[PDB]
C-alpha cells in the first residue's frame, strides 16, 4: 500500500553492514561459551533474508522469524534492565554490572545495536545511499520491525524484579508510544514478573523535584497494576554517583 520510491529521508545502510554483523556474531560467541553452537554465517544469511529484495516499508515480524530461531538465547529472567530514551546510561550500567542484560547485551540486540539497514523492491541490492525514517517515510521498515520483534520476546523472558531506566528530563518521562511503552511493558508476564521498578534519571536542574508522582509515571503504574504486577519508582538524582555506587552490589 506504501508508495514506490527510490530515495528515503533516513541514513543509508551502515558501511560494511554484512562484515560488521558477522564480526559482532563471532565476537559475541567468543565472550559467551553458552552460544558457541551458533553458526554466524547462517545468522547473517537469515538476517539478510529478512529484508533483501523487499520494499523497506512492507517488512513484517514473520520476515525476521528465521533470524529469531537461529538467535534463540536463554537470558536470566531476573537480571533484565529495560530502558526508554536513555540507552547511554543503561549500557554504562550493564558494562559495570556484567551479570545484568539490556536487549543490546543479547546476541541479536548486540548484532543490530547502532546499525541501519534496508533493501530495495525487485533487486538483490542493499541500499547504502538511504533507508526509511520511521517518522518521515514509514513505520514498518527493516530496523523498526526488527527492534519490535526482538523487544517483545525479551520482555516476555523477564521475571522477578524488572528494572526500567527512564529519562526524567524529557517532557514525557514515560512515553506510551515509545518501544518500551507500546511493546515491552505490555509483554511483561504476570506472576512470572513480581515488580517493575522504574529508575527516573534526573538532569541538571537546580529545583530538583520528586519525579515519581509525574502523570506519565502514574500512567505506567496503572498499565502494570492492570497486569497484576507491583510498581516501584526510584528518583536517581545523581546518575554519575549511581554509576560509581552500582559497582558494590
Amino acid at each position, epitope marked *: 500500500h506504501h508508495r514506490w520510491r527510490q530515495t528515503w529521508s533516513g541514513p543509508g545502510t551502515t558501511k560494511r553492514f554484512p562484515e560488521t554483523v558477522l564480526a559482532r556474531c563471532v565476537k559475541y560467541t567468543e*565472550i*559467551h*561459551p*553458552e*552460544m558457541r*553452537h551458533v553458526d554466524c554465517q547462517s545468522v547473517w544469511d537469515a538476517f539478510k533474508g529478512a529484508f533483501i529484495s523487499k520494499h523497506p516499508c512492507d517488512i513484517t515480524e514473520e520476515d525476521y522469524q528465521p533470524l529469531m530461531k537461529l538467535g534463540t538465547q*536463554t*537470558v*536470566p*529472567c*531476573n*537480571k533484565i534492565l529495560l530502558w526508554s530514551r536513555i540507552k547511554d546510561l543503561a549500557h554504562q550500567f550493564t558494562q559495570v554490572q*556484567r*551479570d545484568m542484560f539490556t536487549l543490546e547485551d543479547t546476541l541479536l540486540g548486540y548484532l543490530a545495536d547502532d546499525l541501519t539497514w534496508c533493501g530495495e523492491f525487485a533487486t538483490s541490492k542493499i541500499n547504502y545511499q538511504s533507508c526509511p525514517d520511521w517518522r518521515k517515510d514509514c513505520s514498518n521498515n527493516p530496523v523498526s520491525v526488527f527492534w519490535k520483534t526482538v523487544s517483545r520476546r525479551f520482555a516476555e523472558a523477564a*521475571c*522477578d524484579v524488572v528494572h526500567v531506566m527512564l529519562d526524567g528530563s524529557r517532557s514525557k518521562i514515560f512515553d506510551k508510544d515509545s518501544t518500551f511503552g507500546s511493546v515491552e511493558v505490555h509483554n511483561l508476564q504476570p*506472576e*512470572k514478573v*513480581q515488580t517493575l521498578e522504574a529508575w527516573v534519571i534526573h538532569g541538571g536542574r537546580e529545583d530538583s523535584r520528586d519525579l515519581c508522582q509525574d502523570p506519565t509515571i502514574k500512567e505506567l503504574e496503572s498499565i502494570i497494576s492492570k497486569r497484576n504486577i507491583q510498581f516501584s519508582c526510584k528518583n536517581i538524582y545523581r546518575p554519575d554517583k549511581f554509576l560509581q555506587c552500582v559497582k558494590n552490589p
Partner: antibody, heavy 121, light 108 residues
Framework: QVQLVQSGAEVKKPGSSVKVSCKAF????????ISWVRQAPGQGLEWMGR????????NYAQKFQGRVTLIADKSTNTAYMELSSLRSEDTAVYYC??????????????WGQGTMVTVSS | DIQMTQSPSSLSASVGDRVTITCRAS??????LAWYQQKPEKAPKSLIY???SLQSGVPSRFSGSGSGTDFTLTISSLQPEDFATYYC?????????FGGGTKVEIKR
C-alpha cells in the same frame, strides 16, 4: 545426546585436596552456569556452589567458602571443582550439573554421572 | 537458609495409582522450585523447573503445582520406572537448598 562426563573415583587422606573434572560431550552445551552438588552415602543432596561460564564468577554455600574453588576456563571445554583440607565427612559422590540460564540462579536440567570421593586415614 | 520439608518421607504405591508428594519452603520462593528423580547407585534426573514446567523428554504423566511456600509433584498413573526417590530444590535465593526426599516404593 549432550552429556556431562566427570573424572573417576578418588581416595584421599585427610588434609589433602581433590580436583574433579566436568566436560560436555555429544551435542550443544548451552548451559549458562555449572552447579556442584554432593551426596554423602545414604544421605540427601547438598548444593556446594556454581560458576557463570561467560563471567567466571562463582557463588558458594557458606560451609564451602574458602575450601572450594570452581573453574570454567572460557578457552577450554572442561570445568573443575577443587575441594581442599579434606575431612572424613567430605566422603560423598560429587555431581556437576548444567543450568540452562532461564534465571540466575536456575534449576539444573543436566547432571554428570558423579565422582565418588572417599576421605579416610 | 530456606528449609525445604518433603512429606511423606516414604510412600507405598502400586502401578496405575495416582501419586501426589509435597514440598514446603520455610519462606516464599515464588515458583523457583525444581523436582529431581534418583534411583539407587545412579545420578539424579531433572523432572520439573519453575514449579510446573516439565524438562524435555519427561513423560506427560508428571505434573507440578505450587506458588509461594507449598508445592506438589503428581504422577497421574504410576509406571514401574517411576519407583524412585524424588527431591525438591528451591533456587529462589542462596544457599540453594534441597528437601530430604520422598521414596516411592512398591506396595505389597
Amino acid at each position: 545426546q549432550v552429556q556431562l562426563v566427570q573424572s573417576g573415583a578418588e581416595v584421599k587422606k585427610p588434609g589433602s585436596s581433590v580436583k574433579v573434572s566436568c566436560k560436555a560431550f555429544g551435542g550443544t552445551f548451552s548451559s549458562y552456569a555449572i552447579s556442584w552438588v554432593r551426596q554423602a552415602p545414604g544421605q540427601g543432596l547438598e548444593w556446594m556452589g556454581r560458576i557463570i561460564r561467560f563471567l567466571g564468577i562463582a557463588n558458594y554455600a557458606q560451609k564451602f567458602q574458602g575450601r572450594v574453588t570452581l573453574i570454567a576456563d572460557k578457552s577450554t571445554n572442561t570445568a573443575y571443582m577443587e575441594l581442599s583440607s579434606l575431612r572424613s565427612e567430605d566422603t560423598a559422590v560429587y555431581y556437576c550439573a548444567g543450568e540452562p540460564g532461564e534465571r540466575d540462579p536456575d534449576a539444573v536440567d543436566i547432571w554428570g554421572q558423579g565422582t565418588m570421593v572417599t576421605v579416610s586415614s | 537458609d530456606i528449609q525445604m520439608t518433603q512429606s511423606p518421607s516414604s510412600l507405598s504405591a502400586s502401578v496405575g495409582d495416582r501419586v501426589t508428594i509435597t514440598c514446603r519452603a520455610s519462606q516464599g520462593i515464588r515458583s523457583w522450585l525444581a523436582w529431581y528423580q534418583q534411583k539407587p547407585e545412579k545420578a539424579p534426573k531433572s523432572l520439573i523447573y519453575a514449579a510446573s514446567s516439565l524438562q524435555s523428554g519427561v513423560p506427560s504423566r508428571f505434573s507440578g503445582s505450587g506458588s509461594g511456600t507449598d508445592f506438589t509433584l503428581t504422577i497421574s498413573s504410576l509406571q514401574p520406572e517411576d519407583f524412585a526417590t524424588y527431591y525438591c530444590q528451591q533456587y529462589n535465593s542462596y544457599p540453594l537448598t534441597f528437601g530430604g526426599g520422598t521414596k516411592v516404593e512398591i506396595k505389597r
